[PDB]
């Protein structure tokens, strides 16, 4: 279980912005440290409402699940927080924050060689999780965190987690399932049930999208309605400007979830761009 965090060791800062029934904060926690040293460290702080008991439980056992799987590219979680009447989830501080905002705000300075990189990073974190059978279920770009820019000298790579896999789809409103196409799949849209490690396969192709894009959202401009018609009449996502992934893109949203391609087969077909 997660370690408990005292409401007297954290400092809540300002407001990273909201998810759905969940509120984001950059906040600091007092710790002692290794050899007993005090820290004043930052963090981040994902804070959902005890009112919302099934939100609450679905949020922290998946937070729960994925932390018992230490590895490089998955988002390091210290502890919760559950002093008063919020269930506050205690962060590691990303310095760069979330992919898809970084997206929009660097596009005219991002080169293809950039966005492989990336994508390769996160084929790698799908598929230590695939190997470990564990569905994340809401992969996108705003769940990618940049820990470390490019190093436009010594040619250092950027360094990209993923975030926590958050409340499940199988417990939310249809309405936001709907509102969450072309992330959720189609499978996904006819039952929350069908979750499964194939949803993830779907999403990663998605989020290359982003990636590709400069952060546009794909579909934004279809309302909910145009959105299911999308899946209705089998439409797939428009190649980005930079084209270069629309090909796994596509291969990635098969509307078959049992021919979407193993996160094996994603990363050599990455390694061959
Ligand atoms: N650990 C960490 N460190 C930092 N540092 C930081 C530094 C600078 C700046 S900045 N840009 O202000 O300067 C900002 C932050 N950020 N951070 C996060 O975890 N952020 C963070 C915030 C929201 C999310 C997130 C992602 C997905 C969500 O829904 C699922 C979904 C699926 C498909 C389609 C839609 C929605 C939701 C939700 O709806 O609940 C929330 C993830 C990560």
């Known amino acids: 279980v997660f370690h408990k965090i005292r409401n007297e060791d954290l400092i809540f800062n300002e407001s990273l912005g909201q998810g759905t029934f969940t509120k984001i904060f950059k906040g600091v926690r007092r710790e002692v440290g290794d050899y007993g040293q005090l820290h004043e460290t930052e963090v981040l702080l994902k804070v959902l409402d005890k009112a919302h008991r099934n939100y609450s439980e679905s949020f922290f ?11 490089k590219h998955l988002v390091l979680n210290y502890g919760v927080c559950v002093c008063g009447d919020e269930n506050i989830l205690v962060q590691e501080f990303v310095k760069f924050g979330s992919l898809d905002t970084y997206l929009k705000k660097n596009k005219n300075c991002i080169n293809i060689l950039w966005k492989l990189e990336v994508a390769k990073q996160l084929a790698a974190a799908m ?14 770009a705003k769940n990618i965190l940049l820990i470390r820019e490019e190093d436009r000298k010594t040619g250092n790579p950027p360094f990209i987690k993923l975030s926590d896999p958050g409340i499940s789809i199988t417990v939310l409103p249809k309405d936001i399932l709907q509102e969450r196409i072309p992330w959720v799949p189609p499978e996904c849209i006819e039952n929350p049930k069908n979750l499964n490690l194939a949803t993830d396969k779907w999403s990663f192709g998605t989020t290359l999208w982003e990636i590709c894009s400069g952060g546009d959202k794909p579909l934004s401009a279809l309302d909910s ?15 980005p400007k930079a084209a270069e992934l629309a090909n796994l893109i596509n291969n990635c949203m098969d509307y078959e979830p049992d021919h979407r391609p193993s996160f094996r087969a994603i990363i050599r077909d990455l390694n061959s761009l």
């Open 225 to 239: 309605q145009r959105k299911l018609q999308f899946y209705e009449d089998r439409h797939q996502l428009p190649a």
């Open 61 to 71: 056992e998946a937070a729960s699940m994925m932390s018992k799987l230490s590895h």
């Open 127 to 140: 598929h230590f999780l695939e190997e470990n059978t564990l569905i994340h279920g809401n992969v996108c």
